């Protein structure tokens, strides 16, 4: 019944240093094995930074020395992560681990953008069918969110309530910007009696909007 | 600093069948010390196997590693949907620890078409003074396809932003958005837009459009 959950400030601009916060509950720091952190680059890369031993000692990959600093507070039981001077190499998602054997035992990950660009809310636009022009048996709405940044963004249809037949992509980053889509199929019966919402939700920017699709 | 090098990167295979990814060091390294991580979309790798050939907590049987020196390699009997994902190996038999590129596996399927939609800019975008043109190309395999925009039966290749899913876990198939951003300014300028998509599931390409005219 071991749980880690990694923390931080997911932008941060360049030269600047970085603090993440592992907070590990259900066993102590102190009782046994190595505290790693690990992160993966866009693109899938793995990479080992280090760890911090139960017994308080260190060990960092020789790459990262110099800006690299581990360390934990017993009382709060949790270790930490310090990088400073991060360039834009840096940005990814941060990872912190445990786990020997036939177990092991990982965070659910924290991104990390490294970027002088400037935060920037959502547009968030309907995307109801042409006019006249689509009876089928299934019909298709969309939701276009764009001009966001930094990446993470939240969206549901109709706070939860859709999640079958529902398509949300990858967001794309376009001239230090970020463009992001979800479309939903429903049996045409059920639009636009049944209100069909798009829920998005930026917390960079702590922002919050909601759009139904509204026929044309 | 031991390189692990990882092969194949990519592939696709047929359920049923029997898989063999690969790991070369390049140098030596201990047995004990090379573990096996499968990692799934939005998740966090998991280990899979640990020092070359024991298998991990919650692993299927069908899973097998085995390998020394400097060649380990992960070996699947009988592909199944679920061991569609990326697995890496891992070295902590030298300081530093290193992992591998990874290899992505693909689940082959049945062949099918895709359901497309179009749809034409809102009125809010427009208010903004610009247009964005949204086409979704749903359910579909192979992976690879084709995607032209015509304006007024002219092809327009600039402002294309596209973006795919990952093979989805319920039918294997993959989802495509295709987005074409112009100027309020353009749009005005045209009276027709099709998004029309090229794939194997036919000879003809599967084509939807609108007149901003019929509106």
């Known amino acids: 019944d071991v749980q880690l959950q990694e923390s931080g400030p997911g932008l941060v601009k360049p030269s600047q240093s970085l603090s993440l916060t592992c907070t590990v509950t259900?066993?102590?720091?102190?009782?046994?094995?190595?505290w790693n952190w690990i992160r993966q680059f866009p693109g899938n890369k793995l990479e080992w930074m280090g760890y911090?031993?139960?017994?308080?000692?260190?060990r960092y990959n020789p790459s990262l020395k110099s800006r690299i600093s581990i360390t934990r507070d017993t009382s709060k039981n949790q270790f930490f992560l310090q990088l400073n001077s991060v360039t834009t190499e840096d940005t990814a998602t941060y990872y912190c681990?445990?786990?020997?054997?036939?177990?092991?035992?990982w965070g659910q990950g924290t991104l990390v953008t490294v970027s002088a660009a400037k935060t920037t809310p959502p547009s968030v636009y309907p995307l109801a069918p042409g006019c006249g022009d689509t009876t089928g048996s299934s019909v298709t709405l969309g939701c276009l969110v764009k001009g966001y940044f930094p990446e993470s963004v939240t969206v549901t249809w109709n706070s939860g309530s859709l999640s079958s037949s529902v398509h949300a992509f990858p967001a794309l980053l376009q001239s230090g910007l970020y463009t992001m889509s979800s479309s939903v199929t429903v049996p045409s019966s059920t639009w636009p009696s049944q209100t069909v919402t798009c829920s998005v939700a930026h917390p960079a920017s702590s922002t919050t909007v909601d759009k139904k699709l509204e026929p044309k | 600093d031991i390189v692990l090098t990882q092969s194949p990167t990519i592939m696709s295979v047929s359920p049923g069948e029997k898989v063999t990814l690969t790991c070369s060091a390049s140098?030596?390294?201990?047995?004990?010390?090379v573990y096996w991580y499968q990692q799934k979309p939005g998740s966090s790798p998991k280990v899979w196997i640990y020092?070359?050939?024991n298998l991990a907590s919650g692993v299927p049987a069908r899973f097998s590693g085995s390998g020394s020196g400097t060649s380990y390699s992960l070996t699947i009997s009988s592909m199944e949907a679920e061991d569609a994902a990326s697995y890496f190996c891992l070295q902590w038999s030298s300081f530093p620890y290193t992992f591998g590129g990874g290899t992505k596996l693909e689940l082959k399927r049945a062949d099918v078409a895709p359901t497309v939609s179009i749809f034409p800019p809102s009125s809010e975008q427009l208010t903004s003074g610009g247009a964005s043109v949204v086409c979704f190309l749903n359910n579909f395999y192979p992976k690879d396809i084709n995607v032209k925009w015509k304006i007024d039966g002219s092809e327009r290749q600039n402002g294309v932003l596209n973006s795919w899913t990952d093979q989805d876990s319920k039918d294997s198939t993959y989802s495509m958005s295709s987005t074409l951003t112009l100027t309020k300014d353009e749009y005005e300028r045209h009276n027709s837009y099709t998004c029309e998509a090229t794939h194997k599931t036919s000879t003809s390409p599967i084509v939807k459009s609108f007149n901003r005219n019929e509106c």
């Open positions: 020092s070359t050939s």
């Open positions: 911090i031993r139960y017994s308080g000692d260190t």
């Open positions: 259900g066993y102590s720091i102190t009782s046994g094995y190595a």
């Open positions: 681990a445990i786990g020997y054997g036939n177990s092991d035992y």
């Open positions: 140098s030596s390294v201990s047995s004990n010390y």
